[PDB]
């Protein structure tokens, strides 16, 4: 029975938030499997919890999205590295971190409009996470690889992201809720238009960390586990420096 969290972070977006670090296709049988390699930056802690799909707080372990990004084999994302870094820098025995995984692989931002299944799941899980009395401290968002494939999607990305942030702040009644988004590292196509939108968005209490240059898996699309540690540390640095 974990002690409930008091500092809650919502993790959302597509598969580089859901986590694919360490997921490899078994050469013997073609099954995708997480290699279970866990950097010490991602180590579990009784003061770092995860909201399960069945809405129970449990001690957090990678992969954080197993019961959330269903139908996809999950690996390491940036969440545990983020959480350990924040917990350690806070240096406060009382701080208990709660992570609310909401990401869904293969999703373009149109699938996150207000009213959509994924958006409503994110809002519902965020509301459920507050019942323990904990405060929502930030939303970490890493998405956009699915928006590079069609120029209409890439050219609308900044407007769609502005609307998503406005929607979340409204529906959660948190007008200043910090959002930390990630300029995508990969995807091909109109990646530069999507990155320009992410890096160029200027909104109160929204910051963008850049994943460009982080190591990619053999598919040239997903971050490796060591990249995810780097990204989680960068997301923690942005959270700590801007919002604490």
The residues assigned a catalytic role are 15, 219, 222
SS3 assignment, position 30: coil
DSSP state of 104: -
Q: What is the DSSP string of 173-231?
A: T-TT--EEEEE-S---TTHHHHHHHHHH---TTEEEEE-TTS-B-TTSSSB-HHHHHHH
Could you give the CA distance from residue 145 to residue 184 in angstroms, rounded to a whole number?
7
Facing residues of 99 across strands?
9, 50
Contacts of residue 121, defined as CB under 8 A and 6 or more positions apart, other chains included, come to: 102
Residue of 35, 122, 74, 118 lying closest to 222 (CA atoms): 74
Residue of 148, 133, 139, 141 lying closest to 220 (CA atoms): 148
Residue linked to tokens 């992410």: 198
């Amino acid at each position: 029975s974990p002690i409930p969290p008091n500092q809650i972070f919502i993790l959302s977006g597509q598969s580089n938030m859901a986590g694919r670090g360490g997921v490899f296709k078994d050469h013997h049988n073609n099954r995708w499997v997480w290699d279970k390699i866990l950097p010490p930056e991602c180590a579990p802690n009784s003061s770092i919890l995860r909201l399960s799909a069945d809405l129970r707080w449990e001690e957090a372990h990678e992969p954080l999205h197993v019961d959330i990004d269903t139908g996809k084999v999950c690996g390491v994302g940036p969440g545990m590295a983020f959480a350990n870094a924040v917990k350690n820098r806070l240096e406060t025995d009382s701080a208990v971190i709660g992570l609310v995984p909401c990401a869904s692989g293969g999703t373009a931002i149109k699938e996150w409009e207000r009213g959509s299944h994924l958006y409503e799941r994110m809002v519902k899980r965020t509301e459920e996470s507050r019942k323990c009395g904990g405060e929502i401290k930030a939303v970490l968002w890493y998405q956009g690889e699915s928006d590079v494939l069609d120029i209409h999607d890439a050219e609308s990305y900044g407007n769609n992201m502005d609307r998503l942030i406005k929607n979340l702040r409204h529906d959660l009644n948190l007008p200043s809720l910090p959002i930390i988004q990630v300029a995508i590292a990969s995807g091909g196509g109109y990646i530069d238009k999507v990155r320009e939108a992410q890096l160029g968005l200027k909104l109160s209490n929204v910051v963008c960390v850049d994943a460009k240059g982080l190591p990619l898996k053999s598919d040239n699309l997903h971050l490796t586990t060591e990249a995810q540690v780097q990204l989680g540390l960068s997301l923690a640095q942005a959270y700590l420096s801007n919002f604490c």
